[PDB]
Design a protein around this motif. Structure first.
Motif, PDB file in Angstrom:
ATOM      1  N   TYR D  82      18.342   9.251  -4.100  1.00 24.56           N
ATOM      2  CA  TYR D  82      18.273   7.947  -4.455  1.00 24.56           C
ATOM      3  C   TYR D  82      17.132   7.436  -4.211  1.00 24.56           C
ATOM      4  O   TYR D  82      16.267   6.594  -4.939  1.00 24.56           O
ATOM      5  CB  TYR D  82      19.320   7.127  -4.621  1.00 24.56           C
ATOM      6  CG  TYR D  82      20.284   7.618  -5.566  1.00 24.56           C
ATOM      7  CD1 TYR D  82      21.764   8.211  -4.788  1.00 24.56           C
ATOM      8  CD2 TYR D  82      20.344   7.837  -6.683  1.00 24.56           C
ATOM      9  CE1 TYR D  82      22.698   8.526  -5.764  1.00 24.56           C
ATOM     10  CE2 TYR D  82      21.322   8.420  -7.532  1.00 24.56           C
ATOM     11  CZ  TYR D  82      22.574   8.663  -7.291  1.00 24.56           C
ATOM     12  OH  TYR D  82      23.453   8.964  -7.875  1.00 24.56           O
ATOM     13  N   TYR D  87      17.154  10.521  -8.852  1.00 23.54           N
ATOM     14  CA  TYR D  87      18.653  10.339  -9.418  1.00 23.54           C
ATOM     15  C   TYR D  87      19.332  11.521 -10.069  1.00 23.54           C
ATOM     16  O   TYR D  87      20.506  11.434  -9.682  1.00 23.54           O
ATOM     17  CB  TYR D  87      18.532   9.163 -10.627  1.00 23.54           C
ATOM     18  CG  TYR D  87      18.240   7.920 -10.260  1.00 23.54           C
ATOM     19  CD1 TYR D  87      17.048   7.524  -9.760  1.00 23.54           C
ATOM     20  CD2 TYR D  87      19.340   7.192  -9.992  1.00 23.54           C
ATOM     21  CE1 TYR D  87      16.987   6.303  -9.180  1.00 23.54           C
ATOM     22  CE2 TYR D  87      19.052   5.777  -9.588  1.00 23.54           C
ATOM     23  CZ  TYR D  87      17.978   5.512  -9.133  1.00 23.54           C
ATOM     24  OH  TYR D  87      17.977   4.103  -8.686  1.00 23.54           O
ATOM     25  N   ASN D 110      29.075   3.883  -6.608  1.00 18.64           N
ATOM     26  CA  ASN D 110      27.695   3.963  -6.448  1.00 18.64           C
ATOM     27  C   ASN D 110      27.077   4.997  -7.303  1.00 18.64           C
ATOM     28  O   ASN D 110      26.168   4.868  -7.686  1.00 18.64           O
ATOM     29  CB  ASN D 110      27.286   4.372  -4.997  1.00 18.64           C
ATOM     30  CG  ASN D 110      27.490   3.024  -4.343  1.00 18.64           C
ATOM     31  OD1 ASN D 110      27.698   1.883  -4.640  1.00 18.64           O
ATOM     32  ND2 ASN D 110      27.615   3.073  -2.833  1.00 18.64           N
ATOM     33  N   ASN D 113      27.149   3.575 -10.984  1.00 14.36           N
ATOM     34  CA  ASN D 113      25.869   2.584 -11.169  1.00 14.36           C
ATOM     35  C   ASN D 113      24.626   3.631 -11.270  1.00 14.36           C
ATOM     36  O   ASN D 113      23.808   3.431 -11.911  1.00 14.36           O
ATOM     37  CB  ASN D 113      25.694   1.400  -9.928  1.00 14.36           C
ATOM     38  CG  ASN D 113      26.595   0.655 -10.545  1.00 14.36           C
ATOM     39  OD1 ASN D 113      26.475  -0.250 -11.343  1.00 14.36           O
ATOM     40  ND2 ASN D 113      27.890   0.726  -9.650  1.00 14.36           N
ATOM     41  N   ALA D 114      24.615   4.703 -10.252  1.00 16.12           N
ATOM     42  CA  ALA D 114      23.601   5.529 -10.260  1.00 16.12           C
ATOM     43  C   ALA D 114      23.364   6.276 -11.616  1.00 16.12           C
ATOM     44  O   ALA D 114      22.237   6.432 -11.945  1.00 16.12           O
ATOM     45  CB  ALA D 114      23.507   6.529  -9.147  1.00 16.12           C
ATOM     46  N   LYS D 115      24.507   6.534 -12.121  1.00 12.10           N
ATOM     47  CA  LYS D 115      24.618   7.467 -13.461  1.00 12.10           C
ATOM     48  C   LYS D 115      23.960   6.378 -14.698  1.00 12.10           C
ATOM     49  O   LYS D 115      23.259   7.059 -15.486  1.00 12.10           O
ATOM     50  CB  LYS D 115      26.057   7.815 -13.881  1.00 12.10           C
ATOM     51  CG  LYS D 115      26.064   8.730 -15.161  1.00 12.10           C
ATOM     52  CD  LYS D 115      27.467   9.073 -15.180  1.00 12.10           C
ATOM     53  CE  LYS D 115      27.882  10.217 -16.445  1.00 12.10           C
ATOM     54  NZ  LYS D 115      29.348  10.712 -16.623  1.00 12.10           N
ATOM     55  N   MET D 116      24.316   5.107 -14.459  1.00 13.85           N
ATOM     56  CA  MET D 116      23.756   4.236 -15.638  1.00 13.85           C
ATOM     57  C   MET D 116      22.326   4.274 -15.599  1.00 13.85           C
ATOM     58  O   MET D 116      21.827   4.273 -16.629  1.00 13.85           O
ATOM     59  CB  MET D 116      24.277   2.758 -15.339  1.00 13.85           C
ATOM     60  CG  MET D 116      25.756   2.616 -15.420  1.00 13.85           C
ATOM     61  SD  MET D 116      26.073   0.987 -14.748  1.00 13.85           S
ATOM     62  CE  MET D 116      27.877   1.287 -14.364  1.00 13.85           C
ATOM     63  N   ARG D 117      21.696   4.199 -14.116  1.00 13.32           N
ATOM     64  CA  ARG D 117      20.394   4.283 -13.910  1.00 13.32           C
ATOM     65  C   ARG D 117      19.759   5.615 -14.055  1.00 13.32           C
ATOM     66  O   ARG D 117      18.585   5.702 -14.592  1.00 13.32           O
ATOM     67  CB  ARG D 117      19.853   3.658 -12.545  1.00 13.32           C
ATOM     68  CG  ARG D 117      18.716   3.879 -12.058  1.00 13.32           C
ATOM     69  CD  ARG D 117      17.642   3.155 -12.628  1.00 13.32           C
ATOM     70  NE  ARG D 117      16.358   3.568 -12.173  1.00 13.32           N
ATOM     71  CZ  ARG D 117      15.633   4.740 -12.482  1.00 13.32           C
ATOM     72  NH1 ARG D 117      16.015   5.551 -13.425  1.00 13.32           N
ATOM     73  NH2 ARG D 117      14.404   4.804 -11.858  1.00 13.32           N
ATOM     74  N   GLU D 118      20.422   6.539 -13.881  1.00  8.24           N
ATOM     75  CA  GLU D 118      19.874   7.965 -14.020  1.00  8.24           C
ATOM     76  C   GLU D 118      19.411   8.267 -15.424  1.00  8.24           C
ATOM     77  O   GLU D 118      18.169   8.691 -15.725  1.00  8.24           O
ATOM     78  CB  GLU D 118      21.062   9.052 -13.837  1.00  8.24           C
ATOM     79  CG  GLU D 118      20.360  10.548 -13.705  1.00  8.24           C
ATOM     80  CD  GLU D 118      21.612  11.401 -14.063  1.00  8.24           C
ATOM     81  OE1 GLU D 118      22.817  10.969 -13.987  1.00  8.24           O
ATOM     82  OE2 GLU D 118      21.544  12.518 -13.908  1.00  8.24           O
ATOM     83  N   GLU D 119      20.088   7.521 -16.286  1.00 13.61           N
ATOM     84  CA  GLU D 119      20.017   7.733 -17.845  1.00 13.61           C
ATOM     85  C   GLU D 119      20.849   8.773 -18.699  1.00 13.61           C
ATOM     86  O   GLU D 119      21.390   8.517 -19.727  1.00 13.61           O
ATOM     87  CB  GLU D 119      18.508   7.891 -18.223  1.00 13.61           C
ATOM     88  CG  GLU D 119      18.212   7.615 -19.830  1.00 13.61           C
ATOM     89  CD  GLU D 119      16.650   7.624 -20.223  1.00 13.61           C
ATOM     90  OE1 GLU D 119      15.986   7.796 -19.346  1.00 13.61           O
ATOM     91  OE2 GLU D 119      16.472   7.631 -21.200  1.00 13.61           O
TER      92      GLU D 119
END
Lengths: 119, 153, 119, 119, 153, 153
Positions: D82, D87, D110, D113-119
């Motif tokens: 990350y 991601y 984590n 939230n990372a998944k939200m950001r991964e897309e």
């Protein structure tokens, strides 16, 4: 090999402020590898820290023989000589340190005051 | 005869000649407890030796008082054995005078827990350290502290 | 040799409060040099510090066999025995410590209270 | 043997926050004993701590090859990915860590939230 | 065990029998410094001898107090060796009484740094001036001052 | 080293054993003058002997004070020589205690100018009355008075 572990152990002890170990570990490491100038300088720093300025000199001088461009050591050596009252020797060691490293502002002011005291 | 469960009794003692002293200190404590003195009310502390005790005992009391635990009685303990010098005679005397003065100056009984012996065998016998001679005098000191601290009230 | 480095490493760990290392480093050092009584006492101190009083005893006893004049160890050994409730053993270890070192004022008071409790 | 002392030395350095030593001591220890997965994970942690995330990955991956059930490492590996902006790789490493250890609540939040950001 | 870095300790000492005394004075100073007493907090002054010390020590304290440097403890130091006259016995005694009284009168511990010896060898041994006998007692006096000055606070 | 020109020093002395005492009294005066003490500031008066001096010295001081000439220091002088009775031992002792107490009670140094000798030769030597033995101790007493009276100010 063993010297590296001994240098890493002494190094950790230097950082932690424990000179009995820092000294023994470097002496051991140096017996295994005598050409490590940095360790010899640091060994001198341990003795220096303990107030053992003559010993510090012995090790600093050895370290300089191995690598005489270490301006910081030249300075530290002069300091060990100043602590012993050896102003004439000490002023040359600080002046050499400054010549090697002109940006050693602290050496400039300390050698200047030392010169006043040297006479 | 007497009940020491309500009394705070301190012992201040010399470190020097510990074999004799520890027997004396315990002798007094065992008896104090037999008279009901609670072990927590027996305060035991040390000083190097006999020169410290004559005034050390006041300093000791003042501290215990400040801490909220003033003593009802005190037994400074120590052993003087005559040597080749005259320190024995001068300490024995001035110690005795200080301890007698302190019976009034501290407001409490001060027990002369100090020995003034010429030999070791005599001090050892006084502590009951010798099975065949005397008795542990510490026991009398303990009992005396309880009586002096209650008798005159 | 390796034992010295291992003793220096354990020593640093003892000073820093890390007994997992202090213990392993001394055990290693001792395997290399079993006669180091100081290390055996210190090993006992690490176990002692961890609440491992029986282990502390084992190492303290070994260390005393190597050097029985260590009054501090005699005291520490008695303490490990007191922690285990072994008052009779423990009082002898404190008394021996005091006999070896009459100036151990702390042993005097602690053995005196321990004696009261021993019965 | 030497590796143990080297691992103990590095370990002490990790605990003390000195990674130059922690890294060299573990590399030495690993040269002597390459199968120590814990040391490889820790080596990765030293590099990770220094911001050297790609290096951290190299060592974490080696350590996982030796022992892939280390859920914490799977997590730490995802974190190194990350930090590099990786991601997609990173989310798989966190998800694997959670599957190995369902109680890793921090990984749950984590990775979410990372998944939200991964897309 | 004790930290003397916050204490002012004075030594007042006799000039007479200097060989013994200087060893005693330094013995105490070295230990005081080992307990952290700063060298600048150790006040060393002299008087002719043993008759001066018993009161000289009060006068000494009063001056140090006026100067803003009151002492926490004092060790008057001196050596009495029995001669052909009885000055030894009378000085030993009155000195001891003054020094004990001064433990309360000055508000600080007063250490009996005075020797009461019959011979020179005894005083010399007490100062550790003789390698094969006794020890330098000055060291104990130093340590005692630190403990007495901190222990009872 | 010290300047005694501003000091009033009194000597109160025994009449008995005058040969020894007069040498002692003058010894002290000569030195006091060498330190600058003015002769008019040296007050010399007598009493019969050693029983009078221990309190006589206070009465002496009180009178000098009332007259507007309070002393800065005092040296009572006298000689005790052991006889067939024990008056020597009891006087030596109580005298010493009074003189030590008076170091605080009078507000000034009180110098023990009293001899406690077993023989006449010893007292005579202490006064420097014997050319081949000791020295005139009166001189030290004089010097001490000057130092004690100035040193602690």
């Amino acid at each position: 090999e063993e010297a590296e572990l001994a240098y890493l152990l002494g190094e950790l002890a230097y950082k932690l402020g424990e000179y009995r170990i820092a000294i023994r570990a470097y002496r051991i490491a140096l017996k295994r590898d005598p050409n490590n100038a940095e360790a010899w300088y640091n060994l001198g720093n341990a003795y220096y820290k303990q107030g053992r300025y003559r010993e510090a000199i012995e090790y600093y001088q050895k370290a300089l023989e191995l690598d005489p461009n270490n301006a910081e050591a030249w300075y530290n050596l002069g300091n060990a000589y100043y602590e012993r009252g050896e102003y004439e020797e000490a002023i040359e060691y600080y002046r050499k340190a400054l010549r090697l490293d002109p940006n050693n502002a602290d050496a400039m002011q300390n050698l200047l005051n030392a010169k006043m005291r040297e006479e | 005869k007497y009940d020491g469960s309500k009394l705070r009794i301190g012992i201040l003692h010399a470190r020097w000649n510990a074999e004799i002293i520890l027997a004396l200190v315990l002798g007094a404590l065992k008896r104090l407890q037999e008279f009901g003195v609670k072990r927590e009310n027996i305060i035991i502390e040390t000083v190097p030796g006999s020169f410290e005790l004559p005034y050390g005992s006041k300093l000791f009391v003042e501290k215990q008082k400040r801490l909220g635990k003033p003593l009802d009685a005190i037994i400074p303990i120590g052993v003087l054995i005559k040597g080749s010098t005259m320190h024995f005679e001068y300490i024995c005397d001035s110690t005795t005078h200080q301890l007698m003065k302190l019976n009034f100056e501290l407001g409490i009984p001060v027990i002369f827990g100090v020995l003034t012996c010429l030999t070791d065998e005599q001090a050892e016998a006084r502590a009951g350290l010798i099975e065949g001679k005397m008795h542990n005098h510490g026991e009398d000191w303990g009992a005396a502290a309880v009586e002096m601290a209650t008798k005159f009230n």
